[PDB]
């Protein structure tokens, strides 16, 4: 029960809460050292909108600093992705809870 990517592994039962809490906080409310303020709206899939919010290596919440992981999701916990900046971009899809 994990999701593998460029150099790390994140346990599955933690990405879900990151994808959900990002739809309850305000938009552009948490500043960052680089990049910019998050969460940021993304491109549209099957209607509605998407949001992106950084996550840390272990899987805990992110308050401020620097990051190299991101989670993008819709407001149904159906379409979820994991994003990695690192050396190069690498995207993997996330299954849906049942």
């Amino acid at each position: 029960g994990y999701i593998t990517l460029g150099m790390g592994s994140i346990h599955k039962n933690d990405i879900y809460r990151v994808a959900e809490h990002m739809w309850t906080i305000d938009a552009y409310s948490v500043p960052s050292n680089n990049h910019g303020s998050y969460p940021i709206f993304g491109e549209e899939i099957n209607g509605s909108v998407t949001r992106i919010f950084p996550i840390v290596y272990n899987g805990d919440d992110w308050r401020s600093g620097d990051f190299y992981y991101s989670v993008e999701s819709t407001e149904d916990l159906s379409y979820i992705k994991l994003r990695y900046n690192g050396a190069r971009y690498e995207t993997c899809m996330v299954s849906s809870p049942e």
Binding site: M7, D26, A27, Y28, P31, N34, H35, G36, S37, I40, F41, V56, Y57, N58, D60, S64, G65, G86, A87, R88
Partner: protein, 931 residues
């Protein structure tokens, strides 16, 4: 070069040892007095001999290969031993043995120079040869550099997608007998002409007319196992799992899939020449159906072997004109005006005919002319000129363009050569953070300790900017326009690797080890997937942890890096830190991201560390009760780790210049905080709050006269106290070069106004200001913030707001790239026309207004014909405050109307915080309250 660089730093080092240590022993001082004079003569002699290349010094260069380079190490092995170990063990007899070798070297210099024909500059030496942390800001990155790279990437697009000729030679016009035969066309070009982008246009636009398609890169791996596996994935369709396969059976392996199938595959970014024949053998002879094979290459000679059959054709991208090429050149040198040098200007352009005017060769030669200002008569016209080959069609391979990059390498001033060579330890196209690289240069000692007592980090920063300046490393920008990472070009990587492996400076393990011993000395090793006691730098990347020996078998090691690795407390490598005791020479122990359980108790026995980076470790809880001997360290990063500092363990650590992540309990913020006079950056986290704690923090901060960065945060959920911010604004005065201020505690802008009219030197370096709990933002507050001459990133929130409107003046904010003013329900925001000249991203809120205009008006901001420099997204919130849905929807459309004639087309987003999105009844009769 390497020989002079490694020795040029020991003369100041042993001179400092005489001042600090050797003055105590009269007998040793006399012996070191002989050591000092010989070293001053010998290293200076090597500089004079430095005009003669190393290899011509058969007596000397082979003696580095045997003794001298090791002598520069064994001396350094006892130089670092002189400070503490020799002070305890009294290894004076070792000096007598070594000075004899130098005496022979002194005799050799008298003899070798006399025999080799060099001028006898030994007796001629007597005739011919003979506090503040900020020494000098040598240079900042040239502002014109960012625009120049922007045009180059935009210029390659226009010169791409011109495949009208390429489609003609594809022979895919109609039905013909020749169209039924195999036609494998190869395209070749220089490093930067942009054929890789062009090759995609044919691939995408021909999908309908072809049954199958494929596109997979090769890269800089000269192997067949990887490409065959990649090819079989997308021959015409996925073909399940075929990882376990052989190269010989590829003839049959491709046979079972495309025996009579119309196949259209494309192979790009290849440096191998016989690969074309091998796949062609697997593709059999010419068929009777009709297929095309397109391959690109950056080496013509490699492509010449790839394309040397009848029917096949060679297509190369043209040179970038003669008029459009001047734009990429004349911008870098003469931004405004020049009418003095034109004949030399034009003739230097025609020099590039060896490549024709390729983008890479233009930038490398142009930027070498100007580093910070213009230059004297060039005189380059007499060296490279035109006689350096002619690569229009035949010398364009690694015969001519390589020489152009080689000429610029030898013009770099002295010490920059050794710093640039060190970048070979990183893989292709890797991301190199600025902070990590600079703090590693100091550890090994590539920065000459000039002016005797200035910060090494700042001098290291000067080197990085100058490398960015000309052509050697490509910057990677970020928010507010700063370079926080760098990249190395593809061809420049080849030049560094060949030059590095010729002098054996750094060894790169491919994944199976290198048979280097005795003469092939192993000095600095980089690992990317006995008799090694002479190693002094080991680096491991997070893909080869399974291949590494234990930590015990090391005795002279200096740098040990395990960033992002899996040292931790997991896996099956038995990688416990126990056994680190026998490493009493380390200068860089970077455990950046491993899940460390407990720091070893003997870590304090290594009284030579300069940097210690624990960038992320959640389960770390306490420092060992032995960290009091570290009096030579500059770096200590503790972010992401919940550790409580021990009592009375931080006072005698008086060498710090940066500290990131600590807590406060009773008096650690006052008893052992003001003693650190060299601290420059501070990052702290507060747990609790009372007047007996903030008072101690403020008093200590007054004694730190050399602080330029400050970050404060809170951890407790309750933050009703306003004590910390008000106390700081009344007593403390910022230094002359204060740079960063970030705070999340509750704050007031009256305090910031106090600092402005106290400082003798008004704030002229505060480039950032982050505040997330401001209460009041008044009209007088915005003007004062807008008068700062170096601000680059502002982000202010608001709570308990009591004003009705705010305006941003036209004459005001000048160097702002980010704007994050997000006041609450009140404070309608109206931008003054033609303001924020260089803003790149803004967020602004609006509300219900009313009572502002007599009639019912659509909510209008100032955005029509304004913000003429937006590039990234623009965000506008919306606040109802007990209003009508129809008004809110009108506000959504009104804002989007203004930013539609903007001649840059930036993306626009909106978000309704009260979540009006419902069953969508227009006559909702008010929505909610402010909650």
């Amino acid at each position: 070069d390497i020989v002079t660089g490694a020795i040029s730093n020991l003369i100041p080092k042993l001179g400092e040892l005489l001042t600090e240590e050797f003055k105590l022993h009269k007998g040793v001082k006399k012996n070191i007095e002989d050591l000092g004079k010989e070293l001053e003569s010998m290293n200076a002699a090597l500089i004079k001999i430095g005009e003669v290349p190393r290899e011509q010094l058969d007596s000397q260069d082979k003696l580095w290969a045997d003794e001298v380079r090791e002598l520069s190490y064994v001396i350094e092995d006892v130089v670092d031993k002189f400070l503490v170990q020799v002070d305890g063990i009294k290894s004076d007899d070792n000096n007598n043995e070594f000075e004899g070798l130098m005496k022979r070297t002194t005799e050799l210099l008298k003899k070798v120079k006399h025999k080799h024909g060099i001028a006898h500059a030994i007796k001629d030496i007597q005739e011919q040869l003979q506090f503040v942390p900020h020494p000098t800001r040598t240079i900042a990155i040239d502002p014109c550099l960012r625009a120049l790279y922007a045009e180059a990437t935009e210029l390659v697009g226009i010169y791409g997608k011109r495949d009208q000729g390429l489609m003609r030679l594809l022979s895919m016009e109609g039905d013909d007998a020749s169209n039924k035969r195999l036609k494998k066309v190869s395209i070749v070009g220089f490093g930067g002409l942009g054929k890789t982008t062009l090759a995609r246009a044919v691939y995408e636009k021909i999908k309908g007319d072809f049954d199958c398609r494929a596109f997979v890169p090769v890269g800089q791996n000269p192997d067949m196992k990887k490409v065959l596996r990649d090819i079989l994935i997308d021959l015409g369709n996925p073909h399940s799992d075929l990882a376990m396969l052989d190269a010989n059976q590829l003839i049959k392996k491709l046979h079972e899939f495309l025996e009579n199938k119309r196949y259209l595959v494309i192979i790009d970014d290849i440096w191998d020449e016989k690969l074309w024949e091998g796949i062609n053998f697997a593709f059999s002879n010419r068929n009777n159906l009709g297929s095309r094979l397109i391959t690109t290459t950056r080496i013509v000679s490699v492509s010449n072997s790839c394309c040397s059959s009848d029917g096949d054709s060679v297509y190369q991208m043209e040179p970038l004109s003669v008029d459009d090429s001047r734009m990429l050149f004349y911008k870098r040198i003469f931004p405004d005006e020049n009418a003095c040098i034109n004949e030399f200007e034009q003739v230097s352009r025609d020099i590039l005919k060896k490549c024709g005017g390729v983008p890479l060769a233009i930038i490398t030669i142009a930027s070498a002319l100007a580093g910070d200002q213009k230059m004297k008569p060039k005189c380059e016209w007499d060296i490279l000129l035109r006689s350096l080959g002619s690569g229009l069609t035949e010398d364009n391979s690694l015969e001519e363009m390589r020489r152009i990059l080689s000429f610029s390498y030898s013009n770099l001033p002295s010490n920059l050569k050794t710093c640039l060579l060190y970048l070979c330890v990183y893989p292709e196209d890797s991301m190199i953070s600025r902070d990590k690289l600079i703090w590693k240069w100091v550890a090994e000692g590539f920065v000459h300790h000039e002016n005797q007592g200035n910060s090494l980090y700042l001098l290291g920063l000067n080197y990085f900017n100058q490398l960015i300046n000309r052509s050697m490393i490509q910057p990677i920008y970020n928010y507010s326009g700063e370079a926080y990472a760098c990249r190395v070009h593809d061809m420049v990587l080849d030049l560094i690797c060949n030059l590095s492996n010729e002098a054996k400076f750094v060894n790169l393990l491919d994944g199976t080890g290198n048979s280097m011993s005795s003469q092939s000395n192993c000095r600095r090793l980089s690992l990317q997937k006995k008799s090694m006691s002479r190693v002094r730098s080991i680096t491991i990347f997070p893909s080869a942890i399974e291949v590494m020996p234990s930590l015990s078998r090391f005795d002279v090691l200096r740098v040990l890096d395990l960033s992002r690795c899996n040292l931790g407390e997991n896996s099956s490598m038995q990688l416990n830190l126990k056994g680190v005791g026998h490493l009493t020479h380390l200068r860089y122990l970077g455990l950046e991201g491993t899940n460390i359980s407990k720091l070893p108790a003997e870590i304090g026995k290594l009284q030579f560390l300069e940097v210690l980076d624990l960038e992320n470790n959640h389960n770390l809880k306490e420092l060992p009760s032995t960290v009091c001997n570290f009096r030579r360290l500059i770096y200590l990063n503790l972010v992401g780790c919940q550790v409580v500092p021990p009592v009375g363990v931080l006072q005698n650590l008086t060498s710090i210049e940066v500290l990131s992540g600590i807590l406060v309990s009773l008096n650690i913020i006052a008893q052992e905080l003001g003693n650190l006079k060299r601290l420059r950056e501070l990052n702290i986290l507060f747990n609790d709050g009372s007047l007996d704690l903030y008072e101690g923090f403020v008093k200590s901060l007054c004694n730190l006269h050399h602080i330029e960065s400050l970050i404060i945060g809170c951890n407790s959920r309750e933050t009703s106290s306003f004590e910390l911010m008000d106390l700081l604004g009344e007593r403390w005065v910022p230094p002359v070069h204060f740079r960063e201020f970030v705070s999340s505690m509750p704050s007031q802008l009256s305090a910031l106004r106090g600092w402005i009219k106290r400082d003798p030197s008004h704030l002229s370096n505060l480039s950032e200001l982050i505040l997330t709990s401001v209460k009041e933002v008044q009209q007088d507050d915005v003007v004062i913030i807008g008068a700062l001459s170096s601000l680059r990133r502002l982000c202010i929130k608001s709570t308990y707001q009591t004003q009705r409107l705010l305006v941003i003046p036209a004459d005001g904010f000048r160097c702002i790239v980010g704007f994050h003013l997000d006041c609450g329900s009140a404070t309608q925001i109206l931008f003054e026309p033609g303001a924020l000249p260089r803003a790149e991203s803004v967020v602004i809120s609006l509300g219900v207004r009313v009572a502002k205009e007599d009639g019912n008006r659509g909510f209008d901001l100032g955005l029509q014909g304004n913000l003429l420099s937006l590039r990234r997204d623009v965000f506008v919130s919306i606040y109802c405050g007990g209003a009508r849905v129809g008004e809110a929807k009108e506000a959504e459309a009104a804002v989007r109307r203004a930013l539609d004639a903007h001649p840059s087309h930036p993306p626009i987003y909106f978000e309704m915080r009260p979540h009006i999105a419902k069953g969508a009844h227009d006559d909702d009769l008010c929505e909610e309250r402010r909650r």
